[PDB]
Amino acid sequence: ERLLDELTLEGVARYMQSERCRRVICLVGAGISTSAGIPDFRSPSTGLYDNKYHLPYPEAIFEISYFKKHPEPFFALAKELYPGQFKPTICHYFMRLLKDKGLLLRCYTQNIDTLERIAGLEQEDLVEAHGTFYTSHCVSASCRHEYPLSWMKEKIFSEVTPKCEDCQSLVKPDIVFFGESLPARFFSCMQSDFLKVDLLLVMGTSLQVQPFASLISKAPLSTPRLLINKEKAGQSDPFLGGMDFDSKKAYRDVAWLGECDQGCLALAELLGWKKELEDLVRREHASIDAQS
Ligand SMILES: Cc1cc(C)nc(SCC(=O)Nc2ncc(Cc3cccc4ccccc34)s2)n1
Ligand SMILES: [Zn+2]
């Protein structure tokens, strides 16, 4: 009774091009941006937090109340970690193709780098589960003046603590600090989207950070779930208690292990989309390289 004829990338592609598959939800994380030269900010082994701030504890750099009273460490770190270029990956442009072809219901992302937007996903297509640098707001509840990334970038590089032009309050990028809630939009969209989904495409996430990881359990029981990731992820934790790729009871979950770009390339090829994807990426990359 299962929807995939076989538990392979080939099976997923046949399903995608069948009448049964109309709405795809993508769940994406840091693994879709590493090939764009953006490291994984949640990892301690990427050396981003290797080093004067006098933090009452090392975690305070991520905490909202600390930020509000001592914003300088955050903004110094933001300058240090600011990417040299913003060129979305093959994986990002694969999602743009999903959008173009009327298959994209939603992209839920853990990333803050804005590459989904640069690749042409719109606000309505996105749930930025950990917020984004794309916009920043004055922290004063009575004001909330919104500032674009161009404005915020200028403040970060000039090492001027960003203050609101209307009220002189601190201006904070719309990323979710420890102590802040996840965006309201995350919960709203989750409630509706997973009633409507035909395929989950899970790319570049290890599914270890909650509540993002729990999204896979919101899929209907029949909905195929394809993981494209360097490592297998999402199975039940044998210590406590999921994806089932390999047991005799597996029926809908498929793992393609490798670089996300290569997995998306392989899937696009099966779909007859490889030329379209190559043409889109090369054109967009050229346009970004040519920014004058
Ligand atoms: C600075 C910048 C600007 C743009 C457009 N894109 C990037 S992507 C590269 C990157 O990893 N950067 C980062 N900026 C801040 C980081 C740590 C951090 C600290 C405190 C709170 C956090 C709240 C939520 C998330 C992280 C938080 S990592 N980086
Ligand atoms: Zn203000």
Residue numbers in the entry: 56 to 106, 109 to 298, 306 to 356
From the paper:
The human isotype Sirtuin 2 (Sirt2) deacetylates both nuclear and cytoplasmatic proteins and thereby functions as a major cell cycle regulator, a determinant of myelination, a regulator of autophagy and a suppressor of brain inflammation. In this work, we present the first crystal structures of Sirt2 in complex with a potent and Sirt2-selective small-molecule inhibitor with drug-like properties.
We solved the structure of Sirt2 in complex with SirReal2 and the cosubstrate NAD+ (structure termed Sirt2–SirReal2–NAD+) as well as in complex with SirReal2 and an acetyl-lysine peptide derived from histone H3 (residues 11–17, structure termed Sirt2–SirReal2-H3). Our structures feature a completely new and unexpected Sirt2 conformation, where SirReal2 functions as a ‘molecular wedge’ that traps Sirt2 in the open conformation even in the presence of an acetyl-lysine peptide substrate. We call this a ‘locked open’ state. The position of SirReal2 in the EC-site of Sirt2 is very similar in both structures with either NAD+ or the acetyl-lysine peptide substrate (r.m.s.d. of 0.47 Å), and we will primarily describe the binding of SirReal2 in the presence of NAD+, as this structure likely represents the SirReal2-inhibited form of the enzyme. Structural comparison of the available Sirt2 structures with the Sirt2–SirReal2–H3 complex can be found in Supplementary Fig. 3. In particular, the side chains of Phe235 and Tyr104 that usually cap the acetyl-lysine are rotated towards the surface of Sirt2. Surprisingly, this rearrangement does not prevent Sirt2 from binding its acetyl-lysine peptide substrate, but deacetylation and the domain closure is blocked effectively. The hydrophobic acetyl-lysine–binding tunnel is not formed in all Sirt2–SirReal structures, since Phe235, which usually caps the acetyl-lysine, is rotated ~90° towards the surface. Further thermal stability experiments indicated an additional stabilization of the Sirt2–SirReal2 complex in the presence of either NAD+ or a peptidic acetyl-lysine substrate. These findings were the key to a successful crystallization of Sirt2 in complex with SirReal2 that was only achieved in the presence of either substrate or cosubstrate.
